């Protein structure tokens, strides 16, 4: 159940993430997961992203088998518009 969500930044993307290789958020899974959605942020106004969503792709880059810092870097090294592909639990 993959969904492509396009966000237009409001100032960052307006959510927090957990996970990554060496900092598993769920046992036996290194994926990157959404843990918080900021009121008024881009993700909130879009309305589609939800806590628990797995971010597997940011623009062209994969977030599978990355460290937490690597995911943060990928997500912060983006333009004002950003395409995320997420997997719903």
């Amino acid at each position: 159940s993959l969904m492509n969500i396009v966000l237009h930044k409001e100032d960052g993307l307006g959510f927090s993430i957990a996970g990554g290789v060496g900092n598993q958020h769920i046992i036996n899974d290194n994926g990157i997961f959404v843990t918080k959605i900021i009121e008024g942020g881009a993700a909130f106004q879009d309305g589609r992203l939800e806590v628990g969503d797995r971010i597997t792709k940011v623009n062209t880059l994969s977030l599978e088998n990355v460290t937490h810092e690597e995911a943060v870097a990928i997500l912060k090294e983006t333009a004002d518009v950003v395409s995320l592909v997420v997997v719903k639990p």
């Binding site: 993307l13 927090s16 993430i17 990554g20 937490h68 943060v72 997500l75 912060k76």
Partner: peptide, 5 residues
């Protein structure tokens, strides 16, 4: 580790 982005 919980990182805002």
């Amino acid at each position: 580790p919980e990182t805002s982005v």
